[PDB]
Amino acid sequence: MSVIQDDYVKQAEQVIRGLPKKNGDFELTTTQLRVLLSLTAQLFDEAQLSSDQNLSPALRDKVQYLRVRFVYQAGREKAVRVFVERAGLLDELAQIGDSRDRLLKFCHYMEALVAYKKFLDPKET
Amino acid sequence: MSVIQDDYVKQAEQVIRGLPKKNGDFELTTTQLRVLLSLTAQLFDEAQLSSDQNLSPALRDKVQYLRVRFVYQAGREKAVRVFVERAGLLDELAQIGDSRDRLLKFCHYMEALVAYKKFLDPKETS
Amino acid sequence: SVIQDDYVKQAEQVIRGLPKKNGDFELTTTQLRVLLSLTAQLFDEAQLSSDQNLSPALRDKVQYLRVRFVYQAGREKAVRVFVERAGLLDELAQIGDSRDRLLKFCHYMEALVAYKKFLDPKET
Amino acid sequence: SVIQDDYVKQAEQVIRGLPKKNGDFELTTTQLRVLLSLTAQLFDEAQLSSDQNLSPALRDKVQYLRVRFVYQAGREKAVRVFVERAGLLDELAQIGDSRDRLLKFCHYMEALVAYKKFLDPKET
Amino acid sequence: TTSYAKIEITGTLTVLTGLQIGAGDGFSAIGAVDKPVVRDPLSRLPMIPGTSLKGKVRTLLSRQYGADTETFYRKPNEDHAHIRRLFGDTEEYMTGRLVFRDTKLTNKDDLEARGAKTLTEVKFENAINRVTAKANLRQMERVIPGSEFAFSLVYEVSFGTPGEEQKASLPSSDEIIEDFNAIARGLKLLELDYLGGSGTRGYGQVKFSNLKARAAVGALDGSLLEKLNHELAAV
Amino acid sequence: TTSYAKIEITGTLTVLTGLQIGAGDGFSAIGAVDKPVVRDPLSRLPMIPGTSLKGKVRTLLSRQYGADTETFYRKPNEDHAHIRRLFGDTEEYMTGRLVFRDTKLTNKDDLEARGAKTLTEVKFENAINRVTAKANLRQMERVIPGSEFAFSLVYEVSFGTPGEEQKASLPSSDEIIEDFNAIARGLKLLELDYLGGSGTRGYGQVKFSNLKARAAVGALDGSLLEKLNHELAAV
Amino acid sequence: NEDHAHIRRLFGDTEEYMTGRLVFRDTKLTNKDDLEARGAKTLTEVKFENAINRVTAKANLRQMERVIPGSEFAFSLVYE
């Protein structure tokens, strides 16, 4: 019951090409997601060095906090709300109960949406 | 004891959905909780830096002031009155006592209610 | 001394025992807004002060507060049952010159107007 | 396929036509050092394999390299012109289950950086 | 002009009828009225925030210039070139030239020298019905009419923001007179108005006294500071 | 000079009106205002960065040196030769002789003893539409007045970057007093101006106290450390 | 190679004192468990800076990453 279609690079291109543009550019920039791309790097570098097949309760604690920080950021921003509901990130964060393998697929799918975000439009240098 | 359940993020989603409507747009705003959210953040920044599992007497008299500002704020607003009763914030504040990890448990549950309040509500988002 | 250590628990039982008419709570929160604006300024200068013993000016202001609790409870039947049940005229005689007796009194006083609005309708 | 036969003279066509600014060039090999190290660790591992179909442990190494080319081109201006004039991003999308298709990309990538450094007196 | 300068304009602001700026609205004390006033967060003194003082004078000056030229200025950045010169905008004059300040109460000891007990009074008001007259109550808090505030603002003389297609220059000494003439014209309009609050029901009548200019940084042109003190002489 | 030295200027920066150095983002995460302030990631205290204090003083000195010489400096490589040897550029004086430091709030326990429930206040401002007379509320956060930060600033006496066209030389005893006069002048302009944002509407007034120089490394002369303290006494 | 003789015998040069007597080491963060106990989410902070153009008064936002204050590194140095 995942949103990832086992390719996740075509799917990460089917999201950024469908984002609602404005008169000039996209309504979503990458400076609005810096607080969420900094918390997802701490989950990647912690779950990678773990040898177990299920998450530690100290590692499972900071997935609930990333789940709450996504809801708060999507609540006070219109462009982040239309981006979270398009990719399917808040429904996927409730699928990671304690699986290390389903947490690593989220971090691969997260940075395929950032790579095409820098590429598909200017004003990202 | 323990009016906050584990997996509190699922408990906070059902609290905000169970609020009165008043023509769609909610009766409760986050501006009515502004004097309360600025005191819980000061309490969370002082309990986190501590180390002992028992609260200092300079920290246990800021919990008693916080649970007397909740009662006064729920008395003169009817939108805040039902939200305090629906979430059980006065019963948890009386049962904190002196432990460090029933105060940090209260503040993590407090963040999830404000996070779901801005998400499930239009006439917001600026 | 009458004020306990956990003053919030005993300030709630005072409000539950106030007298009531066919409605409830004949004493309102507008009948003592001239007593609440004098208490809320004694709390400010006592907090900003640094010395432990009170000033001579910080005793003429406490002594003026005690003549207003009798001049307002005299001309009001609802107020004088509240002052005698909460014991506000007994506590103001204990504060001779100690600062922490004042701040413990002003914390207990503002825990009475918290449960005065919460334990009834008719106040917004 | 986008890669033509005798890619060595195709690779000289790409480096000869580039946005040469007021200096010599505008693209430097220090701007693609991260890409040149992930390719060299892929060519030196897919050559030592035996099966014609690529392993699933090598299938996700092509996927991380494809995301890496997309992120670098959108970040740097002078490397965005290089990846489309040479046709590199529409070449990584074809290597699904073929070992020899991976070697055609890596052999063509080696000839591009050889003429990149030889045709300017700034790099070495 | 000839050099860089900063001009300091000091004075005194005294309150004639009871003032209620009232931008607390929840942040204030627990034993307080429904609509409390702005206080200092440490010393609990009543205050004037300086954003209300700047926005009121810009609103009164946009109606004086909008009645002499017979146009309605719909929003800022559409104001006059004399209001957008000393107050800021976001189009061609990007910064002010006028720095307002927050103002605490000063004569606290002079009020307790007389017979004043609280720094803020509490006033009860009524709303009567024009048939079978019944009334509902409200309580208002306002600063007492003996209070005095230490008014001050700074004025800067420099190149400013010249724009991408222009040749930068300093404002001449004839232009500093027209800037100071519009300040004292905008301070005489405030003595008829009410500086925040109810106002039309008798609140916030205010008075200015002892307005004088200095030269805090750098010298002036000469025989120029005394004719800036004459524009401020008629308030 | 014929020696090497490192002089350290210490003092106290106090807060008169409320100060807001914004952060935009930066993880407050529980019901925070739309305009927060810069804090510390571990101690969670309000702080003043070294970029805000260096960049504000440099632009105030380029306005003064620029208007007194009738030249508008449009980039920091075009500044005066007394500005670029103190703050640095990328053509001739490669590194500046001054090192600014970040400051944190010191008197937290002093403010909590005098009755501060929070270290930052929340201010409710309100923009009024000129057509419909409606209300556009906003919430702003700022450091309360009375807060006090520890100020520190280092100065260096060495060869610097003596490029190939010139020979190397220590600064003489007349160039060091010429530099400390520009430091004391530049810190006196900040007291007649603001720090941070929203300063034309009353924010961010500061004041300097107890400025004193001290030779931490090396040997100065006998009548040099009393001439450098004579310059800092005018602030 | 033009430094003082006291400099070139501790740090080394290529003409007289071919190798230095001091051996420096690389150091990494040690109190990583002490920082996370006191409520530090990430080991680095992202700082937002600005560069105001003096002609048009416009902002130029940049983002810098830096190690937070309070960190500790186990210093080491060997002399021979």
Tab-separated table of N, CA and C in Angstrom, chain A residues 15-119:
chain	number	residue	atom	x	y	z
A	15	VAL	N	5.223	14.499	-10.777
A	15	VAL	CA	4.708	15.393	-9.747
A	15	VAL	C	5.131	16.832	-10.000
A	16	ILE	N	6.408	17.047	-10.329
A	16	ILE	CA	6.922	18.405	-10.481
A	16	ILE	C	6.439	19.026	-11.790
A	17	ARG	N	6.116	18.203	-12.789
A	17	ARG	CA	5.521	18.731	-14.011
A	17	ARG	C	4.035	19.017	-13.857
A	18	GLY	N	3.400	18.489	-12.816
A	18	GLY	CA	2.009	18.757	-12.530
A	18	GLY	C	1.762	19.770	-11.436
A	19	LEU	N	2.807	20.425	-10.925
A	19	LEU	CA	2.633	21.421	-9.877
A	19	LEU	C	2.014	22.690	-10.460
A	20	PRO	N	1.130	23.357	-9.713
A	20	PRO	CA	0.435	24.539	-10.249
A	20	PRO	C	1.383	25.721	-10.389
A	21	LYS	N	1.614	26.137	-11.629
A	21	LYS	CA	2.434	27.308	-11.876
A	21	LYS	C	1.614	28.580	-11.684
A	22	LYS	N	2.309	29.706	-11.731
A	22	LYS	CA	1.717	31.031	-11.664
A	22	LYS	C	2.025	31.762	-12.967
A	23	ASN	N	1.743	33.068	-12.978
A	23	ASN	CA	2.039	33.898	-14.143
A	23	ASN	C	3.531	33.903	-14.462
A	24	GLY	N	4.371	34.080	-13.446
A	24	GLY	CA	5.801	34.041	-13.671
A	24	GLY	C	6.445	32.672	-13.570
A	25	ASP	N	6.340	32.030	-12.407
A	25	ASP	CA	7.083	30.803	-12.122
A	25	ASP	C	6.193	29.863	-11.316
A	26	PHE	N	6.824	28.848	-10.726
A	26	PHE	CA	6.164	27.994	-9.751
A	26	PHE	C	5.800	28.790	-8.503
A	27	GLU	N	4.730	28.360	-7.833
A	27	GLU	CA	4.361	28.979	-6.567
A	27	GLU	C	5.140	28.404	-5.393
A	28	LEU	N	5.834	27.288	-5.589
A	28	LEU	CA	6.629	26.645	-4.552
A	28	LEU	C	8.100	26.773	-4.910
A	29	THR	N	8.882	27.363	-4.012
A	29	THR	CA	10.328	27.396	-4.146
A	29	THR	C	10.945	26.371	-3.197
A	30	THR	N	12.275	26.310	-3.186
A	30	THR	CA	12.990	25.362	-2.344
A	30	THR	C	13.443	25.966	-1.023
A	31	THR	N	13.255	27.272	-0.826
A	31	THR	CA	13.608	27.882	0.450
A	31	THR	C	12.537	27.618	1.502
A	32	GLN	N	11.325	27.265	1.074
A	32	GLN	CA	10.254	26.973	2.017
A	32	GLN	C	10.362	25.577	2.607
A	33	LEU	N	11.184	24.707	2.024
A	33	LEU	CA	11.300	23.325	2.466
A	33	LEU	C	12.601	23.041	3.203
A	34	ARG	N	13.352	24.078	3.587
A	34	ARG	CA	14.653	23.877	4.218
A	34	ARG	C	14.527	23.264	5.609
A	35	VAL	N	13.436	23.555	6.319
A	35	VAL	CA	13.255	22.998	7.655
A	35	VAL	C	12.858	21.528	7.579
A	36	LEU	N	12.331	21.086	6.440
A	36	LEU	CA	11.952	19.690	6.270
A	36	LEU	C	13.041	18.865	5.602
A	37	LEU	N	13.882	19.484	4.775
A	37	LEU	CA	15.007	18.772	4.185
A	37	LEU	C	16.181	18.640	5.144
A	38	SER	N	16.180	19.389	6.244
A	38	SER	CA	17.207	19.254	7.266
A	38	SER	C	16.849	18.215	8.315
A	39	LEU	N	15.557	17.963	8.528
A	39	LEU	CA	15.152	16.900	9.437
A	39	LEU	C	15.154	15.540	8.755
A	40	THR	N	15.009	15.509	7.430
A	40	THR	CA	15.029	14.244	6.706
A	40	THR	C	16.450	13.757	6.466
A	41	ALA	N	17.437	14.645	6.568
A	41	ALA	CA	18.822	14.207	6.474
A	41	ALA	C	19.282	13.541	7.762
A	42	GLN	N	18.734	13.958	8.903
A	42	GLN	CA	19.073	13.318	10.168
A	42	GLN	C	18.403	11.961	10.322
A	43	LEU	N	17.300	11.723	9.616
A	43	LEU	CA	16.692	10.398	9.637
A	43	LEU	C	17.404	9.449	8.687
A	44	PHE	N	17.944	9.981	7.590
A	44	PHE	CA	18.676	9.153	6.641
A	44	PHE	C	19.988	8.663	7.237
A	45	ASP	N	20.771	9.568	7.821
A	45	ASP	CA	22.083	9.222	8.346
A	45	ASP	C	22.024	8.440	9.651
A	46	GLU	N	20.867	8.377	10.305
A	46	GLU	CA	20.724	7.570	11.508
A	46	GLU	C	20.236	6.163	11.193
A	47	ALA	N	19.270	6.034	10.283
A	47	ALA	CA	18.741	4.727	9.920
A	47	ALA	C	19.661	3.954	8.988
A	48	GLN	N	20.646	4.617	8.381
A	48	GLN	CA	21.566	3.916	7.492
A	48	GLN	C	22.572	3.088	8.280
A	49	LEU	N	23.132	3.659	9.343
A	49	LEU	CA	24.164	2.996	10.131
A	49	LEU	C	23.614	1.967	11.109
A	50	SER	N	22.302	1.758	11.153
A	50	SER	CA	21.717	0.749	12.023
A	50	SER	C	21.677	-0.595	11.309
A	51	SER	N	22.037	-1.649	12.035
A	51	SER	CA	22.121	-2.986	11.467
A	51	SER	C	20.833	-3.785	11.608
A	52	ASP	N	19.894	-3.331	12.434
A	52	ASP	CA	18.695	-4.103	12.718
A	52	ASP	C	17.704	-4.016	11.559
A	53	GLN	N	16.618	-4.778	11.681
A	53	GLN	CA	15.561	-4.796	10.680
A	53	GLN	C	14.320	-4.033	11.124
A	54	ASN	N	14.312	-3.509	12.347
A	54	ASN	CA	13.231	-2.667	12.830
A	54	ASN	C	13.833	-1.502	13.599
A	55	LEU	N	13.098	-0.396	13.641
A	55	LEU	CA	13.632	0.845	14.177
A	55	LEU	C	13.689	0.822	15.698
A	56	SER	N	14.738	1.439	16.233
A	56	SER	CA	14.855	1.651	17.665
A	56	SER	C	13.807	2.664	18.128
A	57	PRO	N	13.359	2.578	19.386
A	57	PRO	CA	12.383	3.564	19.889
A	57	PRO	C	12.904	4.992	19.957
A	58	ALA	N	14.221	5.199	19.967
A	58	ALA	CA	14.759	6.541	19.801
A	58	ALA	C	14.775	6.976	18.344
A	59	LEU	N	14.841	6.025	17.413
A	59	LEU	CA	14.744	6.322	15.991
A	59	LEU	C	13.300	6.407	15.529
A	60	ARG	N	12.406	5.646	16.160
A	60	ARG	CA	10.983	5.715	15.857
A	60	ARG	C	10.336	6.963	16.445
A	61	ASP	N	11.002	7.623	17.395
A	61	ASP	CA	10.464	8.836	17.995
A	61	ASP	C	10.556	10.035	17.063
A	62	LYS	N	11.617	10.131	16.268
A	62	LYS	CA	11.821	11.284	15.404
A	62	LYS	C	11.202	11.109	14.027
A	63	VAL	N	10.453	10.032	13.809
A	63	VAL	CA	9.596	9.946	12.635
A	63	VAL	C	8.216	10.522	12.941
A	64	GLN	N	7.752	10.380	14.187
A	64	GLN	CA	6.534	11.057	14.622
A	64	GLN	C	6.700	12.570	14.610
A	65	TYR	N	7.893	13.066	14.940
A	65	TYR	CA	8.114	14.506	14.936
A	65	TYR	C	8.252	15.060	13.526
A	66	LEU	N	8.810	14.281	12.600
A	66	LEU	CA	8.807	14.694	11.203
A	66	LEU	C	7.406	14.611	10.614
A	67	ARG	N	6.569	13.719	11.146
A	67	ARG	CA	5.179	13.646	10.712
A	67	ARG	C	4.393	14.868	11.175
A	68	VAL	N	4.702	15.384	12.365
A	68	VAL	CA	4.030	16.575	12.875
A	68	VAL	C	4.531	17.851	12.202
A	69	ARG	N	5.835	17.958	11.941
A	69	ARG	CA	6.393	19.127	11.271
A	69	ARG	C	5.966	19.230	9.810
A	70	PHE	N	5.563	18.119	9.190
A	70	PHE	CA	5.000	18.180	7.845
A	70	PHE	C	3.580	18.735	7.864
A	71	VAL	N	2.787	18.352	8.870
A	71	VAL	CA	1.410	18.826	8.984
A	71	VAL	C	1.373	20.316	9.305
A	72	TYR	N	2.301	20.793	10.137
A	72	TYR	CA	2.330	22.209	10.484
A	72	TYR	C	2.793	23.064	9.312
A	73	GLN	N	3.746	22.564	8.525
A	73	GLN	CA	4.235	23.329	7.383
A	73	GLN	C	3.207	23.357	6.259
A	74	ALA	N	2.466	22.263	6.078
A	74	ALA	CA	1.403	22.239	5.081
A	74	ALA	C	0.175	23.019	5.525
A	75	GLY	N	0.064	23.334	6.817
A	75	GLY	CA	-1.074	24.102	7.286
A	75	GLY	C	-0.946	25.590	7.057
A	76	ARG	N	0.261	26.136	7.190
A	76	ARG	CA	0.476	27.569	7.063
A	76	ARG	C	1.100	27.963	5.733
A	77	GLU	N	1.108	27.069	4.748
A	77	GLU	CA	1.602	27.416	3.424
A	77	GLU	C	0.729	26.757	2.368
A	78	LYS	N	0.323	27.544	1.371
A	78	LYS	CA	-0.547	27.039	0.316
A	78	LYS	C	0.223	26.183	-0.682
A	79	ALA	N	1.443	26.598	-1.031
A	79	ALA	CA	2.235	25.868	-2.012
A	79	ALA	C	2.771	24.556	-1.461
A	80	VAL	N	3.020	24.485	-0.154
A	80	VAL	CA	3.463	23.230	0.438
A	80	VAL	C	2.283	22.277	0.612
A	81	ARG	N	1.072	22.811	0.792
A	81	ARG	CA	-0.111	21.960	0.893
A	81	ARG	C	-0.439	21.302	-0.440
A	82	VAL	N	-0.294	22.039	-1.545
A	82	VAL	CA	-0.560	21.481	-2.870
A	82	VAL	C	0.553	20.560	-3.346
A	83	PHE	N	1.694	20.550	-2.662
A	83	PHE	CA	2.825	19.687	-2.978
A	83	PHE	C	2.850	18.426	-2.128
A	84	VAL	N	2.436	18.525	-0.865
A	84	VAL	CA	2.372	17.354	0.001
A	84	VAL	C	1.224	16.439	-0.421
A	85	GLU	N	0.070	17.019	-0.761
A	85	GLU	CA	-1.067	16.212	-1.193
A	85	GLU	C	-0.883	15.652	-2.597
A	86	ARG	N	0.021	16.225	-3.394
A	86	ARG	CA	0.251	15.725	-4.744
A	86	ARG	C	1.183	14.521	-4.730
A	87	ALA	N	2.293	14.620	-3.996
A	87	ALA	CA	3.247	13.519	-3.944
A	87	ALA	C	2.746	12.376	-3.073
A	88	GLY	N	1.926	12.672	-2.071
A	88	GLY	CA	1.456	11.647	-1.164
A	88	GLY	C	2.452	11.365	-0.062
A	89	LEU	N	2.877	12.413	0.641
A	89	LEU	CA	3.881	12.267	1.685
A	89	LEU	C	3.277	12.029	3.062
A	90	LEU	N	2.132	12.639	3.366
A	90	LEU	CA	1.547	12.478	4.693
A	90	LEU	C	0.864	11.131	4.865
A	91	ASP	N	0.357	10.545	3.783
A	91	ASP	CA	-0.189	9.200	3.876
A	91	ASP	C	0.912	8.151	3.934
A	92	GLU	N	2.070	8.437	3.337
A	92	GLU	CA	3.185	7.499	3.361
A	92	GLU	C	3.910	7.509	4.700
A	93	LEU	N	3.890	8.637	5.413
A	93	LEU	CA	4.539	8.712	6.717
A	93	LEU	C	3.784	7.935	7.787
A	94	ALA	N	2.502	7.651	7.570
A	94	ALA	CA	1.755	6.787	8.470
A	94	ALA	C	1.912	5.312	8.129
A	95	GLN	N	2.542	4.989	6.997
A	95	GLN	CA	2.797	3.600	6.639
A	95	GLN	C	4.056	3.053	7.293
A	96	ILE	N	4.983	3.920	7.689
A	96	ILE	CA	6.214	3.485	8.336
A	96	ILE	C	5.931	3.252	9.811
A	97	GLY	N	5.546	2.030	10.165
A	97	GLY	CA	5.348	1.698	11.560
A	97	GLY	C	6.665	1.610	12.299
A	98	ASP	N	7.462	0.596	11.963
A	98	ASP	CA	8.817	0.486	12.483
A	98	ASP	C	9.774	-0.107	11.457
A	99	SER	N	9.369	-0.218	10.196
A	99	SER	CA	10.195	-0.869	9.192
A	99	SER	C	11.348	0.032	8.777
A	100	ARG	N	12.561	-0.517	8.802
A	100	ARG	CA	13.714	0.215	8.298
A	100	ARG	C	13.699	0.296	6.779
A	101	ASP	N	13.157	-0.723	6.111
A	101	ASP	CA	13.148	-0.747	4.654
A	101	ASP	C	12.160	0.252	4.064
A	102	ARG	N	11.012	0.455	4.711
A	102	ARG	CA	10.059	1.447	4.234
A	102	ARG	C	10.456	2.865	4.613
A	103	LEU	N	11.363	3.027	5.577
A	103	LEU	CA	11.900	4.347	5.879
A	103	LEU	C	12.963	4.763	4.874
A	104	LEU	N	13.733	3.806	4.359
A	104	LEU	CA	14.769	4.120	3.387
A	104	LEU	C	14.196	4.412	2.007
A	105	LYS	N	13.043	3.829	1.669
A	105	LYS	CA	12.400	4.154	0.399
A	105	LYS	C	11.818	5.558	0.408
A	106	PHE	N	11.447	6.063	1.586
A	106	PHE	CA	10.946	7.427	1.690
A	106	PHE	C	12.051	8.438	1.423
A	107	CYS	N	13.256	8.171	1.933
A	107	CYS	CA	14.351	9.121	1.779
A	107	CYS	C	14.910	9.117	0.364
A	108	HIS	N	14.813	7.989	-0.340
A	108	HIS	CA	15.184	7.966	-1.752
A	108	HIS	C	14.164	8.718	-2.595
A	109	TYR	N	12.877	8.528	-2.301
A	109	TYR	CA	11.808	9.230	-2.999
A	109	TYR	C	11.767	10.711	-2.650
A	110	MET	N	12.289	11.098	-1.485
A	110	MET	CA	12.264	12.503	-1.096
A	110	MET	C	13.283	13.315	-1.882
A	111	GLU	N	14.459	12.748	-2.141
A	111	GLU	CA	15.517	13.466	-2.840
A	111	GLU	C	15.436	13.321	-4.351
A	112	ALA	N	14.504	12.518	-4.862
A	112	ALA	CA	14.204	12.544	-6.286
A	112	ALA	C	13.204	13.636	-6.629
A	113	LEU	N	12.461	14.130	-5.636
A	113	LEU	CA	11.587	15.277	-5.833
A	113	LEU	C	12.344	16.590	-5.717
A	114	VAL	N	13.456	16.601	-4.984
A	114	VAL	CA	14.262	17.810	-4.858
A	114	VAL	C	15.181	17.972	-6.066
A	115	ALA	N	15.623	16.859	-6.660
A	115	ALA	CA	16.525	16.926	-7.806
A	115	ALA	C	15.817	17.457	-9.045
A	116	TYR	N	14.590	17.004	-9.295
A	116	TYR	CA	13.817	17.540	-10.407
A	116	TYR	C	13.255	18.923	-10.117
A	117	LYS	N	13.178	19.317	-8.845
A	117	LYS	CA	12.736	20.666	-8.509
A	117	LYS	C	13.779	21.701	-8.911
A	118	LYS	N	15.059	21.380	-8.736
A	118	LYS	CA	16.117	22.289	-9.155
A	118	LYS	C	16.284	22.322	-10.667
A	119	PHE	N	15.880	21.262	-11.361
A	119	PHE	CA	16.167	21.107	-12.779
A	119	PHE	C	15.065	21.643	-13.682
